[PDB]
Design a protein around this ligand. Structure first.
Ligand SMILES: [Ca+2]
Ligand SMILES: [Ca+2]
Ligand SMILES: [Ca+2]
Ligand SMILES: [Ca+2]
Ligand SMILES: [Ca+2]
Ligand SMILES: [Ca+2]
Ligand SMILES: [Ca+2]
Ligand SMILES: [Ca+2]
Ligand SMILES: [Ca+2]
Ligand SMILES: [Ca+2]
Lengths: 199, 198
């Protein structure tokens, strides 16, 4: 009867960040970089595709609100042209797919706004949020929410596993994906929640 | 509510006279989406197939009549789960416009009951996609739980900005059988695409 599935660093609050609009340039602790098209290079520079965590606090240049949860958000920036592929965050969980269970995956998705060194961050690359069992995408929200620059909206993915499902007892996973279907390609995620209830 | 025209949007073509009679030919106005070649070039009644079927009084496979009209569209895949996907595709004449909210609605159905000692219980999963060109703008990948013999409505929404790269490409719709379970039979009906300023 445990209603929440544990997720590591689910609000990207690790690491703690003191300075408003300071961001890391390494994969967030507890997550891996999902990189099926090799858009994120092994050797990052100040100009490559990048990901990490950032502190949204009073005075932020990029949003019309604070973080949806805690201090930080997670971000994915892709430098390649629209259509070049996707990249994002992945985390395999310790829980496994169980039958007669409805899963609800909720994630806040954000659109970088404002300007950076007098350069507009307007535009949005699109997102996808996936619930996995093993390597199988059980359910996903592919870019259904329209999110204005500097704002956040909550995505909800749902999946019901029946006793006959082929992927029972495989490890659950979550992917948070930058679709790179537009620029500016900066995308935020926050407050990942996976909850369960009887089907 | 302002509709974008879609050909054979409720799979009512062809007319089918007999209850629970199904065609095994791709419905007029649609094409077979076949990225993993699961639907063979030379079809038999035992291979993967798509087509349309009449749901009327006396149906053995559903707990309701069709969501719309007489007919539903269906996709059946003979391969094992994990083998790939297949479904229906239709490229529209309308092209993607900026500052415009698109709402795609489609009823998705789960074959139920039995056909000659063989159970149709189980569900393969579905995905409903809105396209511009070859680009999937937005999609519902299997979020609805649909019991055997039942239908539910999937809603996909998308808004494009003036800087969208795919403006002026033709809109498209895909209705996909995910083959993530058996029995693999999957139904679609009543495709609606509506448009409004953002
Ligand atoms: Ca947070
Ligand atoms: Ca920094
Ligand atoms: Ca590195
Ligand atoms: Ca933006
Ligand atoms: Ca909001
Ligand atoms: Ca119909
Ligand atoms: Ca027939
Ligand atoms: Ca079924
Ligand atoms: Ca095509
Ligand atoms: Ca229903």
């Amino acid at each position: 009867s445990v209603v929440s599935i544990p997720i590591n660093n689910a609000g990207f609050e690790d690491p703690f960040i003191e300075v408003v609009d300071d961001y890391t340039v390494d994969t967030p602790p507890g997550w891996t970089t999902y990189n099926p098209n090799n858009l994120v290079p092994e050797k990052r520079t100040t100009m490559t595709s990048n990901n990490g965590v950032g502190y949204v606090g009073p005075g932020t240049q990029f949003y019309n609100q604070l973080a949806p949860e805690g201090r930080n958000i997670g971000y994915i920036y892709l430098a390649q042209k629209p259509g070049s592929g996707v990249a994002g965050f992945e985390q395999i969980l310790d829980a496994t797919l169980e039958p007669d269970t409805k899963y609800t995956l909720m994630v806040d998705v954000g659109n970088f706004g404002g300007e950076f060194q007098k350069i507009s961050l307007a535009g949005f690359p699109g997102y996808r949020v996936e619930l996995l069992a093993g390597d199988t995408v059980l359910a996903a929200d592919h870019n259904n929410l329209y999110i204005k620059d500097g704002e956040f909206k909550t995505s909800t993915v749902t999946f019901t596993a029946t006793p006959d499902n082929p992927y029972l007892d495989q490890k659950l996973g979550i992917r948070l994906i930058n679709l790179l279907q537009g620029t500016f390609s900066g995308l935020d995620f926050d407050n990942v929640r996976l909850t369960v209830e009887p089907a």
